[PDB]
């Protein structure tokens, strides 16, 4: 059950990766808009 | 000792989740303001 814990943490990591790429694209769009 | 690493990585995961929610809420407020 160490492995199931690790496996579920990997989906958490994947969700943070997703959130970060979403923010970067949008923040980049904000930075472009203002230049 | 693998368990404690996992416990400690979970504490890091909640910190990164916290930071992401913080950034989402503030980027949204920005995008909303500029419109």
């Amino acid at each position: 059950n160490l492995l199931r814990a690790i496996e579920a943490q990997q989906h958490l990591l994947q969700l943070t990766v997703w959130g970060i790429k979403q923010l970067q694209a949008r923040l980049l769009a904000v930075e472009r808009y203002l230049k | 000792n693998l368990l404690r690493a996992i416990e400690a990585q979970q504490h890091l995961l909640q910190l990164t989740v916290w930071g992401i929610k913080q950034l989402q809420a503030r980027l949204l407020a920005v995008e909303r303001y500029l419109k």
Binding site: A5, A8, G19 | -
Partner: peptide, 24 residues
């Protein structure tokens, strides 16, 4: 995938790990 889904899933998976942590 949307932020509503993302958020739901954070909770789901957070709960799981914590359960499973207590158990191993």
């Amino acid at each position: 995938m949307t932020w509503e889904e993302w958020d739901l899933k954070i909770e789901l998976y957070t709960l799981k790990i914590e359960l499973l942590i207590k158990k191993s």
